[PDB]
Design an enzyme around this catalytic site. Structure first.
Site, PDB file in Angstrom:
ATOM      1  N   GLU A 112      48.238  45.634  24.052  1.00  0.00           N
ATOM      2  CA  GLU A 112      49.454  45.457  25.157  1.00  0.00           C
ATOM      3  C   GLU A 112      48.862  45.567  26.663  1.00  0.00           C
ATOM      4  O   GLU A 112      49.121  44.668  27.261  1.00  0.00           O
ATOM      5  CB  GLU A 112      50.489  46.429  25.147  1.00  0.00           C
ATOM      6  CG  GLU A 112      51.324  46.582  23.837  1.00  0.00           C
ATOM      7  CD  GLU A 112      52.172  45.079  23.463  1.00  0.00           C
ATOM      8  OE1 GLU A 112      51.961  44.105  24.338  1.00  0.00           O
ATOM      9  OE2 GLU A 112      52.757  44.950  22.372  1.00  0.00           O
ATOM     10  N   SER A 168      51.735  38.975  30.767  1.00  0.00           N
ATOM     11  CA  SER A 168      53.089  38.996  31.160  1.00  0.00           C
ATOM     12  C   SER A 168      53.462  39.365  32.491  1.00  0.00           C
ATOM     13  O   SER A 168      54.123  38.481  32.997  1.00  0.00           O
ATOM     14  CB  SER A 168      53.880  39.374  30.026  1.00  0.00           C
ATOM     15  OG  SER A 168      53.515  39.107  28.745  1.00  0.00           O
ATOM     16  N   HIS A 208      56.832  36.839  26.723  1.00  0.00           N
ATOM     17  CA  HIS A 208      55.591  37.933  26.731  1.00  0.00           C
ATOM     18  C   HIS A 208      54.997  37.484  25.319  1.00  0.00           C
ATOM     19  O   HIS A 208      53.569  37.649  25.194  1.00  0.00           O
ATOM     20  CB  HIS A 208      56.098  39.265  26.568  1.00  0.00           C
ATOM     21  CG  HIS A 208      55.339  40.234  26.345  1.00  0.00           C
ATOM     22  ND1 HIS A 208      54.352  40.779  26.994  1.00  0.00           N
ATOM     23  CD2 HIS A 208      55.303  41.044  25.044  1.00  0.00           C
ATOM     24  CE1 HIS A 208      53.741  41.564  26.418  1.00  0.00           C
ATOM     25  NE2 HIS A 208      54.234  41.861  25.364  1.00  0.00           N
ATOM     26  N   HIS A 229      50.565  37.324  24.187  1.00  0.00           N
ATOM     27  CA  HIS A 229      50.207  37.662  22.704  1.00  0.00           C
ATOM     28  C   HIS A 229      49.395  36.628  21.957  1.00  0.00           C
ATOM     29  O   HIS A 229      48.358  36.749  21.568  1.00  0.00           O
ATOM     30  CB  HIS A 229      51.100  38.246  21.697  1.00  0.00           C
ATOM     31  CG  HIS A 229      51.398  39.757  22.027  1.00  0.00           C
ATOM     32  ND1 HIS A 229      50.703  40.859  21.700  1.00  0.00           N
ATOM     33  CD2 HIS A 229      52.460  40.344  22.505  1.00  0.00           C
ATOM     34  CE1 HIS A 229      51.089  42.017  21.956  1.00  0.00           C
ATOM     35  NE2 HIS A 229      52.400  41.683  22.438  1.00  0.00           N
TER      36      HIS A 229
HETATM   37  C1  LIG Z   1      53.591  49.800  18.520  1.00  0.00           C
HETATM   38  C2  LIG Z   1      54.815  49.733  19.599  1.00  0.00           C
HETATM   39  N1  LIG Z   1      55.855  49.100  18.978  1.00  0.00           N
HETATM   40  C3  LIG Z   1      56.513  49.450  17.981  1.00  0.00           C
HETATM   41  O1  LIG Z   1      56.445  50.724  17.687  1.00  0.00           O
HETATM   42  N2  LIG Z   1      57.589  48.867  17.463  1.00  0.00           N
HETATM   43  C4  LIG Z   1      57.934  47.813  17.927  1.00  0.00           C
HETATM   44  O2  LIG Z   1      58.811  47.011  17.394  1.00  0.00           O
HETATM   45  C5  LIG Z   1      56.921  47.124  18.825  1.00  0.00           C
HETATM   46  C6  LIG Z   1      56.084  47.722  19.627  1.00  0.00           C
HETATM   47  N3  LIG Z   1      55.570  46.841  20.236  1.00  0.00           N
HETATM   48  C7  LIG Z   1      55.941  45.947  20.362  1.00  0.00           C
HETATM   49  C8  LIG Z   1      55.829  44.716  21.221  1.00  0.00           C
HETATM   50  C9  LIG Z   1      55.827  45.062  22.717  1.00  0.00           C
HETATM   51  N4  LIG Z   1      55.228  44.400  23.703  1.00  0.00           N
HETATM   52  C10 LIG Z   1      55.652  45.052  24.877  1.00  0.00           C
HETATM   53  C11 LIG Z   1      55.058  44.886  26.061  1.00  0.00           C
HETATM   54  C12 LIG Z   1      55.528  45.706  27.087  1.00  0.00           C
HETATM   55  C13 LIG Z   1      56.125  46.901  26.659  1.00  0.00           C
HETATM   56  C14 LIG Z   1      56.366  47.120  25.390  1.00  0.00           C
HETATM   57  C15 LIG Z   1      56.186  46.270  24.245  1.00  0.00           C
HETATM   58  N5  LIG Z   1      56.277  46.267  22.969  1.00  0.00           N
HETATM   59  N6  LIG Z   1      57.273  45.863  19.469  1.00  0.00           N
HETATM   60  C16 LIG Z   1      58.105  44.783  19.371  1.00  0.00           C
HETATM   61  C17 LIG Z   1      59.210  44.791  20.023  1.00  0.00           C
HETATM   62  C18 LIG Z   1      59.605  45.695  20.885  1.00  0.00           C
HETATM   63  C19 LIG Z   1      60.717  46.014  21.566  1.00  0.00           C
HETATM   64  C20 LIG Z   1      61.730  44.892  21.327  1.00  0.00           C
HETATM   65  C21 LIG Z   1      61.401  44.115  20.390  1.00  0.00           C
HETATM   66  C22 LIG Z   1      60.291  43.864  19.639  1.00  0.00           C
HETATM   67 FE   LIG Z   2      53.721  43.106  23.236  1.00  0.00          FE
END
Ligand SMILES: CCn1c(=O)[nH]c(=O)c2c1nc(Cc1nc3ccccc3[nH]1)n2Cc1ccccc1
Ligand SMILES: [Fe+3]
Ligand SMILES: CCn1c(=O)[nH]c(=O)c2c1nc(Cc1nc3ccccc3[nH]1)n2Cc1ccccc1
Ligand SMILES: CCn1c(=O)[nH]c(=O)c2c1nc(Cc1nc3ccccc3[nH]1)n2Cc1ccccc1
Ligand SMILES: CCn1c(=O)[nH]c(=O)c2c1nc(Cc1nc3ccccc3[nH]1)n2Cc1ccccc1
Ligand SMILES: [Fe+3]
Ligand SMILES: [Fe+3]
Ligand SMILES: [Fe+3]
Lengths: 341, 329, 329, 341
Positions: A215, A234, A170, A175
């Protein structure tokens, strides 16, 4: 000040990176790898590598296993078929560059260190391995410095097409390609800067905005609808639907933040921006409306945050803006000088 | 079509390694002391070794060299409150606190470099030998200062034949920490990019008269790095104007003793004006995010600069709103 | 709290009518010629009559006055190609074409005024007598030039005791038509608003040394209005630098003969810098739409300026797009 | 150039003012005054006064008849009741000023000359009496110079509440109050500038935009819905409906131009802007998309149009923008100097 703490130098960002609310080692009950203890070792291994990273160190290279590589290959192969016809123009231009410089191919898995140096040269972004889920405050804090936190683990080999969790596939295929775009990069950083010292409610407004843009974002290029959201890139099943017959809405920050984010379900609506320069300027006006006692200016030279709360700092910015306009004049002079125009 | 200059920070390594002179003449005490010569090649060899993205190496602490460093460090200090500009005196105590600047120690460029990058964006890299004025100024365009890792011979601490660590650390570094001085230096660098050789030398003279030896003033103080390094000339300088077009013309004297700048903001815009007179087919904009050089030769590149400047102005507006919002002013 | 100055164009009428001196001394030929005195009061009376929004009146064509005007018109012309700046020579033929500037005719301020408003936004209004330097410069802030409707006595055309129509029309007007000169003059006006009297006089000296008598240069030409008016001094001036802080200090000599400006853009920014040194609690922005003065003393007023400047930059972007769009450049 | 002619100096605008495609003397078949020959004399009289006006002359004062005054009074009286609760904040602030300085009262009819000097001091706008309907090109040309063309005649006394035609009541009570607003003024001028040298299709895109904004525009002030469109202000029946229970859409230029303008029927939809600064910036981006070989800069000093087609004119603008930024610095200096901030 009673305001929430935010990193004010790039080195301070490490505090944000390491506040992991849920580690990757921690698999949810319905997760496919939940009873696979060979998989769990890998998850723990990736978590450990991330925890060992600190600012100023090269992003560690990791050797992926063969099944992980096949898993990546399967995702890479299937998504490639839908990119010519579902991806945005910015995605399409960058992707071949990644094949040439970051080893973005079906039988190889790219290293974050490679991708980071690629991104830093083209748009100033860098990646960091992240041990797990961060607070939206801490995650967005990274964006303010044009630092994207990436998972370094691969999804379970059981079903490559499906993932309930963000993984390196992903991160790499969803990204990175669009982070390379200088204009998309500025747009991302604006969301980050906006969060700095903001209220929790404002932060999660921004988090929702990020979700429906970065996203799951759709952009109209050359009169046609294309996807730029990383989640869409993804997920093949969702990506099909996003651009299919049947609900799309124009991207408006004030309107968009209200909506709810769904992990399992296909999203209720998909927002659209004519361009990333549009999204950046629709963000920078939204950032004004955000409540905080100061404005923030990003200093890319010292990689720190300037606080604009007095006339001295503000004039200093204005003086800089004056000199830069003088350079604009020089260019126009030279252009008339050499081309008679 | 125009003389090549690095357009990315990584391309700058080509400039650093084009060393015209690495090699001591009879006058220098180096041949006389065989031990001294052995060390110098090692420092020269290390500089050649250096590549972009590699942490600056740390030298072996040799007390004879370290003792020599101490003499220069203490002697120059008495003079500074009396003869140095406020910006020096701001930064020097901090150098003592964070970069292990002390009488019994020699700072390691890696410490100094990391200090500068936080305060003004400058970094320092060890240089094997004397560089072309084109390549040296090219580094300034990237806010990269080339330094001599080696220390002068112990025979006479006060007199220095060629630039050394004491000169770079005690003369240049305290001023490289000041954001406006940093902007000033970079302007000289940027102006040189793709310029004719003669324009480049004109700039080299300007650099010599400001960065290496230069004064600013409602009192008169010295901001020249060579002045900070040299005890005798420094007194002479304060004892009984800066215009770049006029200043470039005057000759540079190596041994014999030889301008006033109100502020560095002045010296930065009186430099940027000089840039227009310089002959080239383009203007240059520096991209600090990608650490590269943008070439402004079309409307496309020019507009994106302008658009960026628009957004930055909106931030200025936001600041003013909030300022009224919280203070009613 | 600060000395009153007009904040709307209509308020400027108060300034125009505060005449310290309307009244001829023994040296002037006016008492000697009873006929001449009768006309002068009439022109003085008309100026008093003038109110804002009223078309400038047109005087009776008197050949004796008209004959006198002709002498000055023809004599000064021989000198101008040889001694006047290009901007003069650009505008003078146009004055002949549109404002009936000819040897046998006297231009009417209403014609001249309408000419200036199209080319540089300036307008002229007849003034009853000598004004305070504060009120005169206040007019410049609005791009309003005060003029003397009356003509000098016929006894000696070459010598002039006080400013007259020939001086205003042949000396000032051709340069008031140049947009950059216009911006330059207005800066002097704007600087004076609400300033201390002494700052005002400093400005009056600057004005005297530039607008009334001043030179610009790769050749040397005269741009001073008094120089254009006076045949003898004009030759002397070209026969065998402008810094406002230095220039304000030098004394103004009424009878005895007494700076170089590269361009007026220079003189406009070296003026705007001088404005910062001037003591007042505010800065001033001129609103050409409402023809009024904005006072910048809060963040609210400052932001709207900045926002406006943002929009104007977007227009610059639009221009650059279209330029690439049509020329691929 | 093959481009359509547009006035390039304020004095040239007279050509636009006098190209009347349909005079006020010409009454349509269903018009209430169609068989009233006493009314027709008045219409002809007003047309004649307008035709006699040329640039540089004071706007002629006209003496209204008693029935006309009563007609004006009736409209003035009824609309006043709905303004506290239907008008926008900008309208409300200005209206009392008009009572004090322009004789805006129930028993008096304001003179255009009065209103023009009022508008010129507060927002730079001026009014011109217009003999009749103009081409949308020529009408919008006036806006580029911040000149609004006004009808000077009163609607038929038969039914004061209804009018199928623009009249001085519409001009005075609908348009003038909001023209006084400096920000609304800039917004209006942007539409005008955009039309200059544009294609007919683009012009009528702009005309449609003008119709749904200036004529029938709704703005949200302090979280509530209010009307700023001149048509709405003039018409009590429609004004009620515009803010009533039941269809509103956000104001977007690209979307709005497509819609059709209806003279008789209540409009299909009403557009909304958060502010006039928003409408001005949504217009100035739309103006970029308009096809023409040049951009236009308005010179308020000489009251003429600058053509930006080379680097010389563009730098000149930039240099000006630099100096003005220097003044911004001075103000910030002085502010720190006197207030320690
Ligand atoms: C702003 C929301 N948001 C947050 O608040 N905190 C995050 O840490 C975050 C995030 N968003 C993403 C990256 C991400 N890509 C996604 C794709 C599909 C669904 C959820 C996703 N979160 N992350 C990174 C992440 C997310 C889950 C597990 C490991 C790392
Ligand atoms: Fe993401
Ligand atoms: C613009 C002139 N100029 C150049 O053209 N090229 C350079 O490489 C250079 C330089 N100047 C300095 C540093 C320097 N500091 C000095 C102090 C006193 C006198 C001469 C100095 N040169 N260097 C670095 C340097 C100089 C000699 C030996 C090793 C490294
Ligand atoms: C800044 C000085 N200064 C002032 O303070 N107030 C003024 O009113 C003024 C003026 N300067 C000029 C016009 C003028 N032109 C001159 C030419 C040569 C010498 C003196 C001149 N004054 N005037 C206009 C004027 C002067 C005398 C009689 C009638 C009108
Ligand atoms: C951009 C459309 N548009 C145009 O293209 N040309 C115009 O001349 C015009 C106009 N719009 C208005 C003024 C106006 N106000 C109205 C209110 C309700 C309905 C129509 C209106 N037209 N006018 C002025 C006018 C209109 C009719 C009769 C006399 C004067
Ligand atoms: Fe040096
Ligand atoms: Fe004069
Ligand atoms: Fe209308």
């Amino acid at each position: 000040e009673d305001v929430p703490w935010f990193p004010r130098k790039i080195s301070e960002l490490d505090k944000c990176s390491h506040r992991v609310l849920m580690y990757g080692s921690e698999l949810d009950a319905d997760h496919p790898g939940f009873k696979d203890n060979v998989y769990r070792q890998r998850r723990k291994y990736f978590v450990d590598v991330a925890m060992g990273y600190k600012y100023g160190q090269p992003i560690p290279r990791v050797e992926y296993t063969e099944e992980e590589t096949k898993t990546w290959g399967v995702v890479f192969r299937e998504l490639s078929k839908l990119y010519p016809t579902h991806a945005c123009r910015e995605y399409l231009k960058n992707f071949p560059l990644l094949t040439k410089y970051c080893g973005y191919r079906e039988d190889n898995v790219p290293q974050l260190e490679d991708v980071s140096m690629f991104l830093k040269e083209r748009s100033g972004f860098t990646v960091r391995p992240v041990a797990g889920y961060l607070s939206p405050r801490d995650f967005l804090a990274g964006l303010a410095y044009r630092v994207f936190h990436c998972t370094q683990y691969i999804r379970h080999g059981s079903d490559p097409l499906y993932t309930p969790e963000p993984d390196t596939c992903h991160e790499l295929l969803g990204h990175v390609p669009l982070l390379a775009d200088p204009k998309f990069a500025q747009f991302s950083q604006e969301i980050g800067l906006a969060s700095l010292g903001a209220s929790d409610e404002d932060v999660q407004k921004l988090a929702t905005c990020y979700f429906f843009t970065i996203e799951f974002g759709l952009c109209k290029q050359e009169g046609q609808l294309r996807a730029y959201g990383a989640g869409l890139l993804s997920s093949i099943g969702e990506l099909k639907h996003a651009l299919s017959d049947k609900c799309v809405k124009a991207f408006d920050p004030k309107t968009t933040c209200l909506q709810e984010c769904l992990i399992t379900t296909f999203q209720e609506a998909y927002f659209v921006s004519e361009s990333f320069e549009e999204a950046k300027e629709k963000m920078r006006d939204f950032a004004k409306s955000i409540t905080r006692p100061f404005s923030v200016y990003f200093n890319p030279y010292t990689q720190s945050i300037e606080i604009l709360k007095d006339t001295r700092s503000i004039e200093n910015v204005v003086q800089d803006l004056r000199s830069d306009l003088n350079t604009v004049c020089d260019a126009l002079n030279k252009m008339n000088q050499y081309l008679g125009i």
